[PDB]
Every structure is written in C-alpha cells, then in structure tokens.
Amino acid sequence: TKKGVSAAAFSGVTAALGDVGARWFYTWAADPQGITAPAGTEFVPMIWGRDSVTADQLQRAKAAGSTLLAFNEPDLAGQANMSVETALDLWPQLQATGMRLGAPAVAYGGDTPGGWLDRFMSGAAARGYRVDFIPLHWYGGDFSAAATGQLQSYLQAVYNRYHRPIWLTQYALTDFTPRYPSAAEQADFVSRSTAMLNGLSFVERYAWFSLSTSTTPTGLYTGTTPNSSGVAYRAAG
Structure with a gap:
C-alpha cells in the first residue's frame, strides 16, 4: 500500500476511487470536498496556501485526519506563491495541529542547493x-521510457539531501502552452514509474x-471510464 490519487469531487468520483483501488486520496483542501470514499481509502488533509492558515481551517483538517500536507507549489506564482521565509514563519501554526506534518510540496528544484525546498528544509x-516527511511533485519533460530513471534520480537526490521519507503527491509527464505525452507514452510511464516507486x-x-480528465488532460478517468493510463494505475498497487 503506497498508491493514492489527487481528486476533485467530479461526477463518478466514488466509482473511480473504488475501480482504481486508491489506498488513500487528497483534495488540495482541509476536508474531502464532498467526496465519499470507502474504508481503505484514507483521506489526507492539506493546508494549500497562506489563506488556509487559520484556527478554523486547521481545526477542520485535524478533525479529518492524523496526517497533514502543507502548501501546494509555493515555488509557483500560480499556486501557493509563497516565500520560504513566509512558510517557516507559518510553520508553528501547522505544528499546533499536532498532526504528522508534510513539507510544502515544491513543483521543481527540490534537489537544487539554495532552491526553495533546500532553503525551507534548512531553516x-x-x-x-x-518536518515528518517531504511531499514532492514531478513534471517530467522527457516523454520516453527514460522518464522513470529521471524521476528515480530526482527522488533519490531529495532523500539524500534531507533524510526524511517522501510522498510523490502530484506527478505526470507534462512540459510547461503545456506540452503532453501521447496516450501510449503516458500509459507506459504510469506502468514503469509505479513499479519503480513500489521498490523505492x-x-x-x-x-x-490526477484521477479525472476533467481536472487535467493527464487524468486517469473520464467519469467512471478509465483510459489506458487509468488501467495501468489500477494495476500499479
């Protein structure tokens, strides 16, 4: 059991979750966002940005789980859009939940000295x-069977720098117009990448x-119907 999925509360989400065999899920929010999930699909709360750092939002998270994901892609202007100093200065408010605490999840550069995750983990x-564990994202731009080894190398470097267990909380082949793999390239990468992650x-x-193609063109399901990437993920773990 490592395999989960990010999910919006799209029409058919509960069937998708049951079909794909997600062992956990998250919603980028402090609660399941109207998602109904069976036992054996643990919900993991998230404080997405500077604005969800309030006694109400943190109380809600704490009611919803034992494990907390911090800010989503603080390194991007379009996401949590947060300085390292701001993340560390808020950190005590997230510690005050008492929950098992995941670092803010950088989109890029997690292995780079002087970069966002380095400076946060340093401070x-x-x-x-x-910082009990390190959520990571990965957007591969090499759409070949080489992508798995590249993700492996990124994952190992981060683990080598910080010596905390990792969650890969948001990953796909995507290059930023966004550039996308073929369906076959994507399904093969779902297959190879999950086998490599099962062993790490x-x-x-x-x-x-994500779970739904309504959230992202890299989605596993259209409604309750898996594409060939969804089939690979169903079979992944």
Missing part, C-alpha cells in the same frame, strides 16, 4: 521545527495527477 531544521523504500506514498 526548519535550524529553527528546530518538525523511502517513498511511503504516491499519487498520479
């Missing part, structure tokens, strides 16, 4: 803060981006 340890013992969990 967190210097201040004596708690510091990776506790992974989640393809």
